[PDB]
Amino acid sequence: LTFESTSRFAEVDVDGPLKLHYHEAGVGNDQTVVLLHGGGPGAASWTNFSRNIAVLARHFHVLAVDQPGYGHSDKRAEHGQFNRYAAMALKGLFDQLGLGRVPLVGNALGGGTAVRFALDYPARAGRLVLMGPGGLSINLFAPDPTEGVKRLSKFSVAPTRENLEAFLRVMVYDKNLITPELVDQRFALASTPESLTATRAMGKSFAGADFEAGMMWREVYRLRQPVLLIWGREDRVNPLDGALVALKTIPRAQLHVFGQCGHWVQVEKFDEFNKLTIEFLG
Amino acid sequence: LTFESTSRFAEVDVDGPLKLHYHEAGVGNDQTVVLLHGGGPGAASWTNFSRNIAVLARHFHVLAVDQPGYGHSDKRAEHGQFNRYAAMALKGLFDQLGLGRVPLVGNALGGGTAVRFALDYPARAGRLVLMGPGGLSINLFAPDPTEGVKRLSKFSVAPTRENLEAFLRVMVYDKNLITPELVDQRFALASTPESLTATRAMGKSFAGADFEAGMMWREVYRLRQPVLLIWGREDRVNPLDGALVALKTIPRAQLHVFGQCGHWVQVEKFDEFNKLTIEFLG
């Protein structure tokens, strides 16, 4: 399975044509699962989920979607609350590929989109696996913006290799994962004209006029499906205290916390994460 | 100051005439403060706040109101979400006595009413002091119903002296405060026909069709005034973990927790509570 063998494009309607790029694998497996990646500026499906897509594809029909503003999907300069916007695009995709009720796996920003989708189109979303998810989290103890959020804002204001390395280093517990090669690769994607355009748009929309759409902790008590929250104990972007309202209010919630693991659960604990996901989704 | 020297009655409109009983003190002091008592079946203003009304009256114009369904206020057999109902009655009272923006002090059920009033009639409510408040609390760790809530439900189903003593004993840290005399006095009030009528109505309405009005933790982020949350560390009705969403989301929130103190903060820590209240309200 390669980036190229799996690449797919689709055009959907969200206030007009919108191009979405995704990776498809495991065709011929009966149950479809959608993967929604994290929100780093140079993040994409294929980088986010490399230690995962090939494994989940042994069991599932995997659709790993590049969210609007990331990877090879359209990067608009303007949009409403991001999660609601990305949700609208996913709905368009679901309709065009002929999907009914599908389970969603989403980390960080992608988790917020999974949830917003599950709330906005209740019938279209099955079981959810959410890793250090945004949106449904509210940091009861950590002052906001957290260190991770602050370091993303700083890179947006001053897009240097130095500031990007600093951001990447608070994504993981084992800082040795932040190699010169990873820094350079992410930087080349994150500092392009398109990416700078996108990033801006995103942070700002969390405070437009539809800001309530982002405060999903006020709504998750409406969710009727099983939801597996997964957290790294040392998550410095969306810290563990953010899990509490959602664990309490989602009727069929479960929580798994891994010690010695940061914000990139799917990377630092890829084996454990893959197994936990395969079981949860059947 | 006596129960009799302070007694007052007012008729207000809430889907029709509704009688409210209250105690007035400190007339001639410039700043008015409203006190809203707790929700035990035989609870009332004058019993709830005896170690407090006379003290606060040295500084303030005190209006301690018996909430609908308690004390000598009307006890209707039917009403919507309780806090929203009691809020409507307070609004009627405010309008008739010519009050503008007044600070509110409320414990337990009365705290939920203060908050619901502050949200429903944003201009009418000044600073809030809330002791082990219901409504704005959500117990992130304690399974619901808590022990205190369970023991109230049991008395409602089986109104015996034995079951009432058991309920009273989880209201305080120092169980020695639960004397034979206090048990008997509360029982004589709690087991009357009117009180049984009222209690029923209350628990049930938390689950009518307007149940969302009771989930105030989803709304307190709209509150613009200073709010002093006060908790007993050993509160077994609305436990300390219930304070967290409100402390985080209310911009001008403060929290004070007293060790060695249960659900009746105004009783077990009456000196500390009175001083903290006088300072906070000026």
Curated annotation (Swiss-Prot), chains A, B:
<feature type="binding site">
    <location>
        <position position="186"/>
    </location>
    <ligand>
        <name>substrate</name>
    </ligand>
</feature>
<feature type="binding site">
    <location>
        <position position="48"/>
    </location>
    <ligand>
        <name>substrate</name>
    </ligand>
</feature>
<feature type="binding site">
    <location>
        <position position="264"/>
    </location>
    <ligand>
        <name>substrate</name>
    </ligand>
</feature>
<keyword id="KW-0443">Lipid metabolism</keyword>
<feature type="binding site">
    <location>
        <position position="109"/>
    </location>
    <ligand>
        <name>substrate</name>
    </ligand>
</feature>
<dbReference type="GO" id="GO:0016823">
    <property type="term" value="F:hydrolase activity, acting on acid carbon-carbon bonds, in ketonic substances"/>
</dbReference>
<dbReference type="GO" id="GO:0016042">
    <property type="term" value="P:lipid catabolic process"/>
</dbReference>
<dbReference type="GO" id="GO:0051701">
    <property type="term" value="P:biological process involved in interaction with host"/>
</dbReference>
<feature type="binding site">
    <location>
        <begin position="39"/>
        <end position="40"/>
    </location>
    <ligand>
        <name>substrate</name>
    </ligand>
</feature>
<feature type="site" description="Transition state stabilizer">
    <location>
        <position position="108"/>
    </location>
</feature>
<keyword id="KW-0378">Hydrolase</keyword>
<protein>
    <recommendedName>
        <fullName>4,5:9,10-diseco-3-hydroxy-5,9,17-trioxoandrosta-1(10),2-diene-4-oate hydrolase</fullName>
        <ecNumber>3.7.1.17</ecNumber>
        <ecNumber>3.7.1.8</ecNumber>
    </recommendedName>
</protein>
<comment type="similarity">
    <text>Belongs to the AB hydrolase superfamily. HsaD family.</text>
</comment>
<dbReference type="GO" id="GO:0005886">
    <property type="term" value="C:plasma membrane"/>
</dbReference>
<dbReference type="Pfam" id="PF00561">
    <property type="entry name" value="Abhydrolase_1"/>
</dbReference>
<dbReference type="GO" id="GO:0102296">
    <property type="term" value="F:4,5-9,10-diseco-3-hydroxy-5,9,17-trioxoandrosta-1(10),2-diene-4-oate hydrolase activity"/>
</dbReference>
<keyword id="KW-0058">Aromatic hydrocarbons catabolism</keyword>
<dbReference type="GO" id="GO:0018774">
    <property type="term" value="F:2,6-dioxo-6-phenylhexa-3-enoate hydrolase activity"/>
</dbReference>
<comment type="function">
    <text>Catalyzes the hydrolysis of a carbon-carbon bond in 4,5: 9,10-diseco-3-hydroxy-5,9,17-trioxoandrosta-1(10),2-diene-4-oate (4,9-DSHA) to yield 9,17-dioxo-1,2,3,4,10,19-hexanorandrostan-5-oate (DOHNAA) and 2-hydroxy-hexa-2,4-dienoate (HHD). Is also able to catalyze the hydrolysis of 2-hydroxy-6-oxo-6-phenylhexa-2,4-dienoic acid (HOPDA) and the synthetic analog 8-(2-chlorophenyl)-2-hydroxy-5-methyl-6-oxoocta-2,4-dienoic acid (HOPODA).</text>
</comment>
<keyword id="KW-0442">Lipid degradation</keyword>
<dbReference type="GO" id="GO:0009274">
    <property type="term" value="C:peptidoglycan-based cell wall"/>
</dbReference>
<dbReference type="InterPro" id="IPR000073">
    <property type="entry name" value="AB_hydrolase_1"/>
</dbReference>
<comment type="subunit">
    <text>Homodimer.</text>
</comment>
<dbReference type="InterPro" id="IPR054676">
    <property type="entry name" value="HsaD"/>
</dbReference>
<dbReference type="InterPro" id="IPR029058">
    <property type="entry name" value="AB_hydrolase_fold"/>
</dbReference>
<dbReference type="GO" id="GO:0006694">
    <property type="term" value="P:steroid biosynthetic process"/>
</dbReference>
<feature type="active site" description="Proton acceptor">
    <location>
        <position position="263"/>
    </location>
</feature>
<feature type="binding site">
    <location>
        <position position="107"/>
    </location>
    <ligand>
        <name>substrate</name>
    </ligand>
</feature>
<comment type="pathway">
    <text>Lipid metabolism; steroid biosynthesis.</text>
</comment>
